């Protein structure tokens, strides 16, 4: 909407206070004009028709319980935008400052979040499996990264390409979490998963097997559930990414860690210059090796570490 840029204040899902960029025109809207062509957050009002209504508030204060998922979707979309712009020189998900749209309060008891081809969508959770999913910065960045993937590599959402698609979202979700630097880890969704259980998460990149996800190609799922295991086989690539960044010895194969920033550069380059819609795990290895070669040189530690990590997870 047309209005003047303002700054509201509210509390997120976890009870933390934050400032948010809003727009004033009669109401204060969750419309952040400071980033690209805007970040826009909508109320789906417990229904499934999208996007719903652009979030309107009378006083620019967002401290109601109902406000919390909107505050976080809006704010964490901003952080994710900043990460891509500042770290990778990418302007929004399409590289041309596309408006970023999110809807919260989607459906009832909805234990998921997704990119629907055009926008991000967040359930509130059922209060047991999840609390409102926009409360996780890794979750928000995971969803926005699906848009990035769709505009770039275009990885088809099934089988190996789909597992790469998933891992890319977990990898950048985690890198954005580190970028924001509030309780960062290599776990996925820990801030919004199972409020009654401390210390767990939806997935682990450092040890995917802790939740039964494969950490080696020999343990890949080959059935038809979950689009051929896109959220399962992602563990193999998540583990490789974790090893590239942090190092470790995995099934007897030692990897020298090169750090998060280089992991991010290598995978961002792979995603945007080498991966295609049908890339499989072997092709991702090749893409990552080539990306590291481009950035650091064929004889570099970075290249050696990428090879070590894929060796460790059984991807040749």
Ligand X SMILES: CC(C)C[C@H](NP(=O)(O)CNC(=O)OCc1ccccc1)C(=O)NCC(C)(C)C
Interface ranges with ligand X (CB under 6 A): 112-117, 133, 139, 142-143, 146, 157, 188-189, 202, 231
Q: Where are the beta strands (DSSP E) in 53-135?
A: 53-54, 56-57, 61-62, 100-106, 113-115, 120-123
Phi, psi of 299 (to 5 degrees): -95, 10
Asked if residue 160 belongs to a known ligand binding site, the reply is: no
Say whether residue 19 binds Ca ion (CB under 5 A): no
CB 173 to Ca ion: min, Å: 7
Name which of 251, 253, 234 is nearest 308 in CA terms.
Answer: 253
Residue number with CB closer to ligand X (104 or 292): 104
Asked if residue 138 belongs to a known ligand binding site, the reply is: yes
CB 300 to Ca ion: min, Å: 29
Question: Binding residues for Zn ion, per CB under 5 A?
Answer: 169
Of 88, 105, 143, 250, the catalytic one is 143
Say whether residue 301 binds Ca ion (CB under 5 A): no
Asked if residue 33 belongs to a known ligand binding site, the reply is: no
Q: Is 117 helix (H, G, I), strand (E, B) or coil?
A: coil
Can you state the percent helix, strand and coil of the chain, rounding each to 5? 40, 20, 40
Say whether residue 138 binds Ca ion (CB under 5 A): yes
List 25's β-bridge partners, or say none.
27
CB 192 to ligand X: min, Å: 7
* Per-residue exposure over 251-276, b if at least 16 CB sit within 10 Å of its own CB, e if not: eeeebebbebebbbbbbbbbbbebbe
Q: Is 231 a catalytic residue?
A: yes
Residue ranges at the known binding site for Zn(2+): 142, 146, 166
Binding residues for Ca(2+), by number, are 57, 59, 61, 138, 177, 183, 185, 187, 190, 193-194, 197, 200
């Amino acid at each position: 909407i047309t209005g003047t840029s303002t700054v509201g204040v509210g509390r997120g899902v976890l009870g933390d206070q934050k400032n948010i960029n809003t727009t004033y025109s009669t109401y204060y809207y969750l419309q952040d004009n400071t980033r690209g062509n805007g970040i826009f957050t909508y109320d789906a009002k417990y229904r499934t028709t999208l996007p719903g209504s652009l979030w309107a508030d009378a006083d620019n204060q967002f401290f109601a319980s109902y406000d919390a998922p909107a505050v976080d979707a809006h704010y964490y979309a901003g952080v994710t935008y900043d990460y891509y712009k500042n770290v990778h020189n990418r302007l929004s998900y399409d590289g041309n400052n596309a408006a970023i749209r999110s809807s919260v309060h989607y459906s009832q008891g909805y234990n998921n979040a997704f990119w629907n081809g055009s926008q991000m969508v967040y359930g509130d959770g059922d209060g047991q499996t999840f609390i409102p999913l926009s409360g996780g910065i890794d979750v928000v960045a995971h969803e926005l990264t699906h848009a990035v993937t769709d505009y770039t590599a275009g990885l088809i959402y099934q089988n190996e390409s789909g597992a790469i698609n998933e891992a890319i979202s977990d990898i950048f979700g985690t890198l954005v979490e580190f970028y924001a630097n509030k309780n960062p880890d290599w776990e996925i969704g820990e801030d919004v998963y199972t409020p009654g259980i401390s210390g767990d998460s939806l997935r682990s990149m450092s040890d995917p097997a802790k939740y039964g996800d494969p950490d080696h190609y020999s343990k890949r799922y080959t059935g038809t559930q979950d689009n051929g295991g896109v959220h399962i086989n992602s563990g193999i690539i998540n583990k490789a990414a974790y090893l590239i960044s942090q190092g470790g010895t995995h099934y007897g194969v030692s990897v020298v860690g090169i750090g998060r920033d280089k992991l991010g550069k290598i995978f961002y380059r792979a995603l945007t210059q080498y991966l295609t819609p049908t890339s499989n795990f072997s092709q991702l290895r090749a893409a990552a090796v080539q990306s590291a070669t481009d950035l650091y040189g064929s004889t570099s530690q970075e290249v050696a570490s990428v090879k070590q990590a894929f060796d460790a997870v059984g991807v040749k």
